[PDB]
């Protein structure tokens, strides 16, 4: 397996990575909240299902509002990258990258694939990086805990922004009510962190 970054390349930053959207209505509201709060983030969106109705514009909206769009690689492949033919695996990924580049009007630079202890499948790592796409990890996921906002606050308040940074993994579908997000932003800002997109979080990686 291949190591992936699980913190930013410099201190003082919180990079939220919203993963497995877009979700009709839910994602639109998250984007509204981020815009109002003046924060930048990252959305690792899927493209394994055709975007229905007003979902399609979300891929472009995220980029236009200063966020990064990353590819959440086809979740139906999660069980095992080694289990499909190398060709099947790679062809699918390549098509998804072309699709999300199209929908977002950009060239993606990042992806979200399954992680184990800060590492991803090497075959998948190689497929992405030969295309100039870096799979990313995360420092903390609030859903790993009984009290998500409390554990977040405990971690942030115990840290020091002059030395620390965080990539925080969230899911659109789990934030249908945006109060937790609002609260997490306040907590981070009160402690002195800047909320950044993945481009800024991972500047100069390697
Ligand atoms: Ca704005
Ligand atoms: Ca605006
Ligand atoms: Ca091939
Ligand atoms: Ca520093
Ligand atoms: Cl604005
Ligand atoms: Zn594992
Ligand atoms: Zn999850």
DSSP string, 81-98: GGGS-HHHHHHHHHHHHH
Rounded CA gap, 153 and 5, in Å?
Answer: 22
Please tell me the distance between residue 31's alpha carbon and the centre of ligand 2 in angstroms.
Answer: 9
Rounded CA gap, 140 and 60, in Å?
Answer: 27
Question: Are 9 and 191 contacting, i.e. CB atoms less than 8 angstroms apart?
Answer: no
Among left, alpha and beta (phi > 0; psi -120 to 50; other), residue 2 is beta
Rounded CA gap, 42 and 112, in Å?
Answer: 11
Each domain of the chain, given as residue ranges in start order, spans 1-206
Tally the residues of the chain.
206
Q: What is the 3-state secondary structure (H, E, C) of 55-73?
A: HCHHHHHHHHCCCEEEEEC
Nearest alpha-carbon partner for 27 in 54, 48, 49, 47 = 54
Per the CATH hierarchy, to which homologous superfamily does domain 1-206 belong? Glycoside hydrolase/deacetylase (3.20.20.370)
Identify the nearest ligand to the CA of 12 by its number: 4
- Token pair listed for 8: 């930013």
Rounded CA gap, 149 and 130, in Å?
Answer: 38
* 27 SS3 class: helix
Q: Which value in Å is the resolution of this experimental model?
A: 1.5
Please tell me the distance between residue 116's alpha carbon and the centre of ligand 4 in angstroms.
Answer: 28
Please tell me the distance between residue 80's alpha carbon and the centre of ligand 1 in angstroms.
Answer: 39
Identify the nearest ligand to the CA of 161 by its number: 4
- Token pair listed for 122: 């090497």
Please tell me the distance between residue 90's alpha carbon and the centre of ligand 3 in angstroms.
Answer: 7
Residue pointed to by tokens 């992806």: 111
Please tell me the distance between residue 93's alpha carbon and the centre of ligand 3 in angstroms.
Answer: 11
């Amino acid at each position: 397996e291949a190591d992936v970054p699980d913190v930013c390349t410099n201190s003082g930053m919180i990079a939220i990575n919203f993963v497995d959207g877009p979700v009709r209505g839910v994602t639109d509201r998250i984007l509204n909240t981020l815009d109002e709060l003046g924060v930048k983030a990252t959305f690792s969106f899927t493209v394994n299902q055709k975007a229905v109705g007003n979902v399609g514009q979300l891929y472009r909206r995220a980029v236009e509002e200063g966020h990064n769009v990353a590819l959440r690689v086809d979740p139906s492949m999660d069980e095992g990258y080694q289990c499909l033919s190398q060709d099947a695996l790679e062809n699918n990924v390549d098509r998804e990258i072309d699709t999300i580049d199209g929908l977002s009007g950009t060239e993606i630079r990042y992806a979200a694939v399954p992680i184990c202890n800060g590492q991803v499948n090497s075959e998948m790592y190689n497929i992405l990086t030969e295309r100039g796409v870096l799979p990313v990890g995360y420092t903390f996921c609030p859903y790993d805990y009984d009290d998500p906002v409390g554990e977040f606050e405990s971690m942030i308040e115990g840290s020091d922004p002059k030395h620390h940074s965080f990539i925080i993994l969230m899911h659109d579908g789990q934030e249908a009510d945006t109060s937790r997000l609002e609260n997490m932003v306040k907590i981070g800002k009160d402690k002195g962190y800047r909320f950044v997109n993945m481009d800024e979080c991972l500047q100069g990686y390697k």
